């Protein structure tokens, strides 16, 4: 119906935390595609916000460069694993979650007690493994922000992994129209279509 249309020409879920999408937008007047592409790329790479863990609190740790008996990974490895958890939320503020489990076993991202406004993207993300039945209680802090940043966690808030666009001549120079393609890679916290709309 509309003279100028957009559509998703390809959608792909390569993994649980890596989504792909390609979109088309034609026909555009000459010079419009470049403006849209550059502004959309900068918005996708810089203006889209995400949620991640920013602070984890332990109880019986001298420093983040120490070990725990019964847990294979040290405190530093646990913090690194916690930094890789992908969350999704539409709200702002410093929400807090809780990890309260007893071993032995595997501590995955589905073991986090989240507030109702926060969701887990990948349930299978690894945090730590318990070899014996030791108590483990970790208090987490979650907020929504842009860009990047009790032990502080270096949180990277950008959920768009990469972006690309291309401009192609539509055809005969009646009005020298153009075709715009946009490629978006996200971490699963939001789909490429959601990233396009949010941008």
């Amino acid at each position: 119906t509309r003279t100028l249309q957009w559509k998703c020409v390809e959608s792909r879920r390569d993994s649980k935390r890596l989504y792909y999408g390609r979109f088309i937008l034609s026909p555009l007047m000459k010079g419009q595609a470049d403006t849209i592409g550059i502004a959309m790329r900068r918005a996708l790479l810089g203006e889209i916000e995400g949620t991640c863990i920013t602070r984890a609190k332990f109880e019986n740790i001298p420093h983040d460069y120490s070990n725990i008996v019964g847990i294979q990974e040290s405190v530093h490895e646990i913090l690194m694993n916690l930094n890789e958890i992908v969350l999704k939320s539409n709200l702002y503020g410093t929400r807090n979650a809780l990890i309260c489990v007893q071993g032995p076993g595997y501590i995955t991202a589905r073991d986090i007690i989240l507030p109702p406004s926060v969701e887990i993207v990948d349930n299978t993300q690894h945090i730590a493994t318990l070899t014996e039945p030791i108590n483990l209680c970790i208090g987490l802090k979650i907020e929504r922000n842009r860009g990047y940043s009790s032990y502080p966690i270096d949180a990277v808030f950008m959920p768009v992994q990469n972006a690309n666009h291309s401009i192609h001549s539509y055809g005969n120079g009646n009005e020298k129209q153009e075709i715009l393609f946009i490629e978006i890679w996200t971490n699963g916290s939001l789909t490429p279509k959601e990233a396009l709309h949010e941008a």
């Binding site: 509309r2 249309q5 957009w6 937008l25 849209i36 502004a39 709309h197």
Partner: peptide
């Protein structure tokens, strides 16, 4: 400003079912 906004309105367009 108006031209930029008009350039980015169509990405929010939906179609009748």
């Amino acid at each position: 400003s108006r031209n930029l906004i008009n350039l980015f309105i169509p990405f929010l367009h939906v179609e009748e079912e």
